[PDB]
Amino acid sequence: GSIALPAHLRLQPIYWSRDDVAQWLKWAENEFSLRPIDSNTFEMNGKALLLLTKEDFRYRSPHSGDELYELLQHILAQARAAFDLYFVLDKSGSVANNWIEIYNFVQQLAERFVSPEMRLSFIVFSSQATIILPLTGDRGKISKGLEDLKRVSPVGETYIHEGLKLANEQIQKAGGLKTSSIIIALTDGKLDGLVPSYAEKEAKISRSLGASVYAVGVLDFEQAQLERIADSKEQVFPVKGGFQALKGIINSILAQS
Ligand SMILES: [Cl-]
Ligand SMILES: [Cl-]
Ligand SMILES: [Mg+2]
Protein backbone atom coordinates (compact mmCIF):
# COMPACT_ATOMS: atom_id res chain seq x y z
CA GLY A 1 0.00 0.00 0.00
CA SER A 2 3.02 2.26 -0.45
CA ILE A 3 2.93 5.50 -2.47
CA ALA A 4 6.34 7.08 -3.07
CA LEU A 5 4.89 10.57 -3.09
CA PRO A 6 7.42 13.41 -3.61
CA ALA A 7 8.40 15.26 -0.46
CA HIS A 8 7.29 18.62 -1.89
CA LEU A 9 3.66 17.60 -2.35
CA ARG A 10 1.55 18.57 0.64
CA LEU A 11 -0.03 15.61 2.41
CA GLN A 12 -3.54 16.82 1.50
CA PRO A 13 -4.42 17.33 -2.18
CA ILE A 14 -7.07 20.02 -1.56
CA TYR A 15 -4.20 22.45 -1.04
CA TRP A 16 -2.45 21.50 -4.28
CA SER A 17 -1.90 24.46 -6.58
CA ARG A 18 -2.26 24.20 -10.34
CA ASP A 19 1.51 23.63 -10.48
CA ASP A 20 1.43 20.88 -7.85
CA VAL A 21 -1.10 19.05 -10.07
CA ALA A 22 1.32 19.30 -12.98
CA GLN A 23 4.20 18.00 -10.85
CA TRP A 24 2.07 15.13 -9.53
CA LEU A 25 1.34 14.27 -13.17
CA LYS A 26 5.02 14.33 -14.18
CA TRP A 27 5.91 12.15 -11.19
CA ALA A 28 3.07 9.66 -11.62
CA GLU A 29 4.24 9.14 -15.18
CA ASN A 30 7.77 8.05 -14.29
CA GLU A 31 6.80 6.25 -11.09
CA PHE A 32 4.20 4.09 -12.83
CA SER A 33 5.65 3.69 -16.38
CA LEU A 34 2.65 5.52 -17.81
CA ARG A 35 2.32 6.63 -21.40
CA PRO A 36 3.10 10.32 -22.04
CA ILE A 37 0.75 12.57 -20.08
CA ASP A 38 0.33 16.05 -21.50
CA SER A 39 1.23 18.56 -18.80
CA ASN A 40 -1.97 20.38 -19.85
CA THR A 41 -4.18 17.35 -19.14
CA PHE A 42 -5.50 18.72 -15.80
CA GLU A 43 -5.44 22.52 -15.81
CA MET A 44 -6.74 23.13 -12.31
CA ASN A 45 -5.79 23.04 -8.63
CA GLY A 46 -6.41 20.22 -6.15
CA LYS A 47 -9.82 21.48 -5.08
CA ALA A 48 -10.97 21.23 -8.69
CA LEU A 49 -9.22 17.92 -9.16
CA LEU A 50 -11.23 16.46 -6.28
CA LEU A 51 -14.43 17.24 -8.18
CA LEU A 52 -13.63 15.31 -11.29
CA THR A 53 -15.21 11.90 -11.66
CA LYS A 54 -13.29 8.78 -12.63
CA GLU A 55 -14.99 8.97 -16.03
CA ASP A 56 -13.68 12.53 -16.38
CA PHE A 57 -10.19 11.19 -15.69
CA ARG A 58 -10.75 8.68 -18.46
CA TYR A 59 -11.92 11.36 -20.88
CA ARG A 60 -8.83 13.42 -20.07
CA SER A 61 -6.23 10.65 -20.06
CA PRO A 62 -7.54 7.66 -22.00
CA HIS A 63 -4.39 5.68 -21.20
CA SER A 64 -3.76 6.52 -17.54
CA GLY A 65 -6.93 8.20 -16.22
CA ASP A 66 -8.43 5.34 -14.22
CA GLU A 67 -5.00 4.72 -12.71
CA LEU A 68 -4.55 8.42 -11.89
CA TYR A 69 -8.00 8.54 -10.28
CA GLU A 70 -7.27 5.57 -8.05
CA LEU A 71 -3.82 6.99 -7.33
CA LEU A 72 -5.52 10.15 -6.11
CA GLN A 73 -7.98 8.17 -3.97
CA HIS A 74 -5.19 6.29 -2.17
CA ILE A 75 -3.34 9.60 -1.67
CA LEU A 76 -6.50 11.14 -0.22
CA ALA A 77 -7.30 8.09 1.91
CA GLN A 78 -3.91 8.18 3.60
CA ALA A 79 -4.07 11.96 4.03
CA ARG A 80 -7.25 11.55 6.09
CA ALA A 81 -6.26 8.52 8.18
CA ALA A 82 -5.69 8.73 11.92
CA PHE A 83 -2.14 8.54 13.24
CA ASP A 84 -0.67 8.66 16.72
CA LEU A 85 3.03 9.48 16.22
CA TYR A 86 5.25 9.05 19.24
CA PHE A 87 8.77 10.48 18.93
CA VAL A 88 11.21 8.79 21.28
CA LEU A 89 14.20 11.14 21.34
CA ASP A 90 17.69 10.26 22.62
CA LYS A 91 19.13 12.98 24.88
CA SER A 92 22.18 11.01 26.12
CA GLY A 93 25.69 12.43 26.04
CA SER A 94 26.26 10.21 23.00
CA VAL A 95 24.42 12.77 20.83
CA ALA A 96 25.56 16.09 22.32
CA ASN A 97 27.04 17.25 19.00
CA ASN A 98 23.95 16.00 17.14
CA TRP A 99 20.96 17.43 19.00
CA ILE A 100 20.65 19.68 15.96
CA GLU A 101 20.30 16.59 13.81
CA ILE A 102 17.56 14.99 15.90
CA TYR A 103 15.53 18.16 16.48
CA ASN A 104 15.43 19.44 12.90
CA PHE A 105 14.32 15.97 11.87
CA VAL A 106 11.49 15.87 14.42
CA GLN A 107 10.47 19.37 13.32
CA GLN A 108 10.52 18.70 9.56
CA LEU A 109 8.42 15.59 10.29
CA ALA A 110 5.98 17.36 12.62
CA GLU A 111 5.48 20.20 10.12
CA ARG A 112 4.37 17.61 7.54
CA PHE A 113 1.78 15.72 9.64
CA VAL A 114 -0.80 18.50 9.87
CA SER A 115 -4.12 16.77 9.18
CA PRO A 116 -6.88 17.11 11.82
CA GLU A 117 -6.64 13.38 12.74
CA MET A 118 -2.90 13.37 13.37
CA ARG A 119 -1.66 13.69 16.91
CA LEU A 120 1.96 13.93 18.02
CA SER A 121 3.79 13.23 21.27
CA PHE A 122 7.39 14.14 22.18
CA ILE A 123 9.35 11.88 24.57
CA VAL A 124 12.97 12.38 25.60
CA PHE A 125 15.19 9.93 27.45
CA SER A 126 18.70 9.71 28.87
CA SER A 127 19.00 7.90 32.16
CA GLN A 128 15.34 8.69 32.85
CA ALA A 129 12.48 9.31 30.42
CA THR A 130 10.19 12.36 30.34
CA ILE A 131 7.17 13.37 28.26
CA ILE A 132 7.83 16.84 26.83
CA LEU A 133 4.56 16.92 24.88
CA PRO A 134 1.60 14.67 25.66
CA LEU A 135 -0.09 13.13 22.62
CA THR A 136 -2.13 15.90 20.98
CA GLY A 137 -3.31 17.22 17.65
CA ASP A 138 -3.39 20.78 19.00
CA ARG A 139 -0.95 22.69 16.79
CA GLY A 140 -0.54 25.40 19.42
CA LYS A 141 0.54 22.95 22.11
CA ILE A 142 2.79 21.16 19.62
CA SER A 143 4.59 24.42 18.83
CA LYS A 144 5.39 24.94 22.52
CA GLY A 145 6.46 21.30 22.47
CA LEU A 146 8.96 22.07 19.75
CA GLU A 147 10.21 25.18 21.56
CA ASP A 148 10.88 23.00 24.62
CA LEU A 149 12.85 20.45 22.56
CA LYS A 150 15.18 23.20 21.35
CA ARG A 151 16.38 23.84 24.91
CA VAL A 152 17.12 20.17 25.56
CA SER A 153 20.71 19.77 26.59
CA PRO A 154 21.93 16.21 25.95
CA VAL A 155 23.42 14.46 29.03
CA GLY A 156 23.39 10.98 30.55
CA GLU A 157 23.32 7.32 29.53
CA THR A 158 21.24 5.71 26.74
CA TYR A 159 18.29 4.06 28.48
CA ILE A 160 16.13 3.74 25.40
CA HIS A 161 13.76 1.19 27.00
CA GLU A 162 12.63 3.96 29.35
CA GLY A 163 11.71 6.11 26.36
CA LEU A 164 9.75 3.38 24.59
CA LYS A 165 7.94 2.63 27.86
CA LEU A 166 6.49 6.14 28.00
CA ALA A 167 5.27 5.72 24.42
CA ASN A 168 3.64 2.42 25.33
CA GLU A 169 1.84 3.81 28.38
CA GLN A 170 0.27 6.55 26.22
CA ILE A 171 -0.72 4.05 23.55
CA GLN A 172 -2.37 1.82 26.18
CA LYS A 173 -4.62 4.71 27.19
CA ALA A 174 -5.68 6.13 23.77
CA GLY A 175 -4.59 3.54 21.21
CA GLY A 176 -7.66 2.55 19.26
CA LEU A 177 -8.90 0.70 16.21
CA LYS A 178 -8.29 2.58 12.95
CA THR A 179 -5.73 4.76 14.78
CA SER A 180 -2.32 3.72 13.44
CA SER A 181 0.00 4.32 16.39
CA ILE A 182 3.56 4.93 15.18
CA ILE A 183 6.78 5.07 17.22
CA ILE A 184 9.84 6.91 15.86
CA ALA A 185 13.06 6.41 17.83
CA LEU A 186 15.80 8.90 17.00
CA THR A 187 18.97 7.49 18.52
CA ASP A 188 22.62 6.77 17.82
CA GLY A 189 22.44 3.02 18.49
CA LYS A 190 25.27 2.95 21.07
CA LEU A 191 23.58 0.79 23.70
CA ASP A 192 25.60 -0.33 26.73
CA GLY A 193 24.82 -3.08 29.20
CA LEU A 194 21.34 -4.59 29.30
CA VAL A 195 19.89 -1.73 27.25
CA PRO A 196 20.01 -3.78 24.00
CA SER A 197 18.01 -6.62 25.58
CA TYR A 198 15.50 -4.36 27.37
CA ALA A 199 15.12 -2.33 24.17
CA GLU A 200 14.38 -5.32 21.91
CA LYS A 201 12.04 -6.52 24.68
CA GLU A 202 10.23 -3.18 25.00
CA ALA A 203 9.83 -2.65 21.25
CA LYS A 204 7.97 -5.97 21.17
CA ILE A 205 5.45 -4.52 23.63
CA SER A 206 4.87 -1.69 21.14
CA ARG A 207 4.30 -4.29 18.42
CA SER A 208 2.06 -6.15 20.94
CA LEU A 209 -0.05 -2.99 21.25
CA GLY A 210 -0.52 -2.51 17.49
CA ALA A 211 2.13 0.16 17.07
CA SER A 212 4.75 0.29 14.38
CA VAL A 213 8.30 1.01 15.49
CA TYR A 214 10.57 3.09 13.27
CA ALA A 215 14.29 3.56 14.04
CA VAL A 216 16.22 6.64 12.88
CA GLY A 217 19.97 6.75 13.46
CA VAL A 218 22.04 9.90 13.93
CA LEU A 219 25.68 10.43 12.90
CA ASP A 220 27.50 7.05 13.19
CA PHE A 221 25.07 4.39 14.48
CA GLU A 222 24.82 0.61 14.89
CA GLN A 223 22.81 -0.62 11.91
CA ALA A 224 22.17 -4.09 13.31
CA GLN A 225 21.14 -2.68 16.70
CA LEU A 226 18.35 -0.51 15.27
CA GLU A 227 17.18 -3.32 12.97
CA ARG A 228 16.36 -5.26 16.15
CA ILE A 229 14.34 -2.34 17.58
CA ALA A 230 12.36 -1.50 14.45
CA ASP A 231 9.82 -3.84 12.90
CA SER A 232 11.95 -4.52 9.82
CA LYS A 233 15.18 -3.34 8.23
CA GLU A 234 12.96 -1.28 5.91
CA GLN A 235 11.91 0.79 8.93
CA VAL A 236 15.45 2.06 9.65
CA PHE A 237 16.43 5.41 8.10
CA PRO A 238 19.69 7.40 8.40
CA VAL A 239 19.02 11.00 9.44
CA LYS A 240 21.96 12.05 7.28
CA GLY A 241 19.85 10.77 4.36
CA GLY A 242 18.51 14.32 4.47
CA PHE A 243 15.39 15.08 2.47
CA GLN A 244 15.59 11.55 0.94
CA ALA A 245 15.27 9.48 4.10
CA LEU A 246 12.80 12.08 5.42
CA LYS A 247 10.51 11.40 2.44
CA GLY A 248 11.05 7.66 2.79
CA ILE A 249 9.84 7.39 6.39
CA ILE A 250 6.82 9.61 5.72
CA ASN A 251 5.50 7.36 3.01
CA SER A 252 6.38 4.32 5.06
CA ILE A 253 4.25 5.74 7.89
CA LEU A 254 1.43 6.87 5.61
CA ALA A 255 1.17 3.36 4.10
CA GLN A 256 0.62 1.89 7.60
CA SER A 257 -3.03 3.06 7.42
CL1 LIG B 1 -7.55 16.74 1.24
CL1 LIG C 1 25.96 7.48 26.65
MG1 LIG D 1 24.14 6.89 23.40
Residue numbers in the entry: 1 to 257
How is this structure described in the published paper?
It was then shown that genetic fusion of a panel of target proteins of interest to this TELSAM protein polymer could consistently achieve their crystallization. (i) The long TELSAM polymers are expected to confer increased avidity to any weak crystal contacts made by fused target proteins, allowing crystallization of a greater fraction of proteins. (ii) The regular spacing of target proteins along the sixfold helical TELSAM polymer is expected to pre-programme much of the symmetry and spacing of the resulting crystal lattice.
The vWa domain was chosen because it has been successfully crystallized previously, has a known structure and is only moderately soluble. We determined that the vWa domain could be flexibly fused to TELSAM with a linker consisting of a single alanine residue. This construct included the critical TELSAM V112E mutation that makes TELSAM polymerization pH dependent. This specific inter-vWa contact has not been observed in any previously reported structure of the vWa domain. In view of the fact that a flexibly fused target protein can find a rigid conformation relative to the TELSAM polymer by packing against the polymer, the rigid hydrophobic connection between vWa domains suggests that, while direct inter-polymer contacts are dispensable in forming well-diffracting crystals, a rigid transform between adjacent TELSAM polymers is still required.
